[PDB]
Amino acid sequence: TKQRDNRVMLITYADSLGADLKELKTALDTWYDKAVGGVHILPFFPSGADRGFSPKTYEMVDPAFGSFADVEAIGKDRWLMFDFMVNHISAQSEYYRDFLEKKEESDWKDFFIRYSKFWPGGAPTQEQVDAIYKRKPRAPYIEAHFADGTEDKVWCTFSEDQIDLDVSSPKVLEFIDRTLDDMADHSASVIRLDAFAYAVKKPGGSCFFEAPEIWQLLDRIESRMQARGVEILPEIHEHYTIPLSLADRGYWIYDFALPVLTLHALYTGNGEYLARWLKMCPKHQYTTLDTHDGLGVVDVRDLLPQEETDRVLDLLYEKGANLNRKYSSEAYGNLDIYQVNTTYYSALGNDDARYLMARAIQFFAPGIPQVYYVGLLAGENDLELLERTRNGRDINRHGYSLEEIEENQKRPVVQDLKWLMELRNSHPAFDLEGDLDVASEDGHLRMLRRSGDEALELDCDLVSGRFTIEDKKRGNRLWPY
Known part of the structure; x- marks a missing residue:
């Protein structure tokens, strides 16, 4: 097992970057060798629904994708995140x-x-x-x-x-323990606990993050995996107080508020809500802009005012490339009708400059950035796939051939995002333990990352869509390059 380290993590299906796990390894080794330090391969077990998230078994890899050997091959020099449902x-x-x-x-x-x-x-x-x-x-x-x-x-x-x-049920707890042990044996560095907050049901309860039982289940799983050198990441989409309460007890969390806070900042030129958020985030988090699901809106409650939330949603639908409110409706097969179905690039109207700025903000933000594969290739809304499957989320699940990955390498925005990922993976100022100083003023968002005498400053002009990166220790501008 390669240990989870302080490098950008790719989110991908087994069959979305090339045809299968062997082509995924080829794609990473060929074009992304220094850019991608970790890989979350979305559920790669045989599944009955919800593109992997209805596993039939954990005892074999979906043979469409390859073998456990093909998963371990990727894990040789990239740490791996697996899903446990x-x-x-x-x-x-x-x-x-x-x-x-x-x-x-x-x-x-x-x-x-x-x-x-x-x-x-x-x-x-x-x-x-x-x-x-x-x-x-x-x-x-x-x-x-x-x-x-x-x-x-x-x-x-x-x-x-x-x-x-x-x-x-004791037999279910035995199944959980056995399945996590098997994942640890197959070189998992992190196990993502899918739909974690739903796990405990109580008659008359919300059945969402039911305490104290939800904490006892988390401690059971985290303790068992800690003994195997495996980290755990609970998937929870809701009010920020829930993930920040996990961070307060020493658990890794997702940041699912960054996506919409960043869109709002880039559409309005106002960094105040994004700055307040960045300051309250812990160091041991994974940041997102895109995932394999839609954009979270409940995730920004009490971080973005309701008026500003309504405003940015209107801007995504009006100014984004090929969004449609219907794609979040029951007709398009959604499990969450309150998410916005779009690629992150298309949410920004396929604007290279502001998409790169969003990624720069994400990479200077605390913790470890996750890059979804569609975002890695600055992918646009896939209406062809969405209309074929009638599954709203498929707008953001294009399957790339190796040929299409290669064709995308000529795009400056794809080159520039790869450069930012390589910087995030190499520059010492991005120390997971390092400090972040954030300032929002005059349409700028300034993010200074320090680690000892290292001092790397991102200065985002939210109005112009231009940013600079300055190495204050070495006295040199790194971006533009």
């Missing part, structure tokens, strides 16, 4: 299929949350239904029809294929 498993898994066949005689009788057992009286009251945290209108269950002719309802947060696990 702590919240759910495929309805097409051995576990759920056996439960439908055998019911109370199934080894997996306790793996799923059955309404008849979970709810006092055998069903929720409307009050209890209304209390559950939702990101789409569909009820959070599906019908289970058993081979014996009987039926129940099972908890279903996401797509109809994603059946929620009962983390209160």
